[PDB]
A paper describes a structure:
Deoxyuridine triphosphate nucleotidohydrolases (dUTPases, or Duts) are produced by most living organisms as part of their pyrimidine biosynthesis networks. Their role is to eliminate excess dUTP, which can be mistakenly incorporated into DNA by DNA polymerases, since most of them cannot distinguish between dUTP and dTTP. In addition, dUTPases provide the dTTP precursor, dUMP. In this study, we demonstrate for the first time that the homotrimeric dUTPase of bacteriophage T5 performs an additional, non-enzymatic function in the virus’s life cycle.
We determined the crystal structure of bacteriophage T5 dUTPase with a resolution of 2.0 Å, and we discovered a distinct short loop consisting of six amino acid residues, representing a unique structural feature specific to the T5-like phages dUTPases. The comparative analysis of dUTPase sequences from bacteriophage T5 and the host organism E. coli revealed a low identity of only 34%. Despite the low identity, the overall tertiary and quaternary dUTPase structures of the phage and host were found to be very similar, with a root-mean-square deviation (RMSD) of 1.3 Å when aligning the Cα atoms of the monomers. Although there is limited sequence similarity between the T5 phage dUTPase (T5Dut) and the E. coli dUTPase, the comparison of their spatial structures revealed a high degree of similarity, except for the presence of a specific loop in the T5 and T5-like phages that is absent in the bacterial protein. The structure shows the typical trimeric dUTPase antiparallel β-pleated fold of the subunits. Three subunits are attached to each other in the same manner as observed in other trimeric dUTPases, forming three active sites per enzyme molecule in the region of monomer interaction. A comparison of the amino acid sequence and structure of the T5Dut phage with other characterized enzymes allowed us to identify two conserved amino acid residues (Ser68 and Asp85) within the active site that are directly involved in the enzymatic reaction in T5Dut. We have identified a structural element within T5Dut, a small-loop 30-GTNPAA-35 that is only six amino acids long, which is responsible for the implementation of a novel function.
Residue numbers in the entry:
A (entry chain C): 1 to 139
B (entry chain B): 1 to 136
C (entry chain A): 1 to 134
The structure:
Amino acid sequence: MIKIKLTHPDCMPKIGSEDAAGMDLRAFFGTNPAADLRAIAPGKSLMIDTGVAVEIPRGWFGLVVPRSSLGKRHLMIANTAGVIDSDYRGTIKMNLYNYGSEMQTLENFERLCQLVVLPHYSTHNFKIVDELEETIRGE
Amino acid sequence: MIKIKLTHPDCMPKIGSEDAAGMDLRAFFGTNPAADLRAIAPGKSLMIDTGVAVEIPRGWFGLVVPRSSLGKRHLMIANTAGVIDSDYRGTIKMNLYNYGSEMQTLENFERLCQLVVLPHYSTHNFKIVDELEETI
Amino acid sequence: MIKIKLTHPDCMPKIGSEDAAGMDLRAFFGTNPAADLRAIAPGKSLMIDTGVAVEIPRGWFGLVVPRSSLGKRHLMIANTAGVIDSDYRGTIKMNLYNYGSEMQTLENFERLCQLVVLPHYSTHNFKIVDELEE
């Protein structure tokens, strides 16, 4: 199981169908009255908290990518894609960058990125060698 | 298996060796349009049909990313990477954005993006908790 | 296991905790003192050799994405993300594009991208179908 800890109950990611690859992470601007909206100007970035901390199982990791709706807004994750290790315990942040020409305003709890949980090879299970075994593709 | 449905036979993804991570998806502008080349200006985007609809096995999903040759052309997917759920049944689209400084032209049936099919954890197998466990 | 061939010993990817999803690929500019620093101006790109060639097991592949810290530097992989097939035997390259407004400089052997090794479905295990099930 993925264990999920929420800063506020409304940070709960949007769960899709049984077949969904991912769950939608939402902006969390806080609970104060002024937390209703935040704006990202063209060429600027904003570190957005999701209010979601996760315990991903050992052997898996979290991939954070934009929702397709982010594409129309010309927003991207500044570091392209978030990689959430299974030992990470803080809340997931989305550092969103405005590569378009118009200012983008976001609502509190708006769905912005997908969290997909995938398996990975153990990064300690490697061996340094002097030559690798050749293949037709090679290069 | 990956079930592949083609709008036109020339939409067939380019499948490489047994060891290839992904298959190459192609632009689809129609059978034989007069405008077989479409230009994308700097700062502009173009929604491109691949002509490819897939059924991906349950427990897996499709990741759509540019081919490496798009890097030199300064084209990205507007939403960075496509996420194709295993219950998606339309054709895959590539919304390509020109982030560079010069016009780029795409050709009908040109290979543009890779479709890699990857496993994912069930998004329903979660539990909300009050506190997370520290790490072993 | 993953087999790794390094052009120079200092190219060794940064290995993290046992839980780490990936290992950090480093810039490899050479063995020079002339190789200490490179600059990438806004709107420009630099093809960066990692000095790292890998033999990834069959059934798996390598995904190369920026480190989190590249986001603050407004550097991206020009082709968004690297896809390393299990039969690729050259060294991994990072073609880094400066999409921001400020100058960036990178040091030799500085950690830049994450390499994550993940399974992929066999692209030969497909059927061409007349019409799909909805």
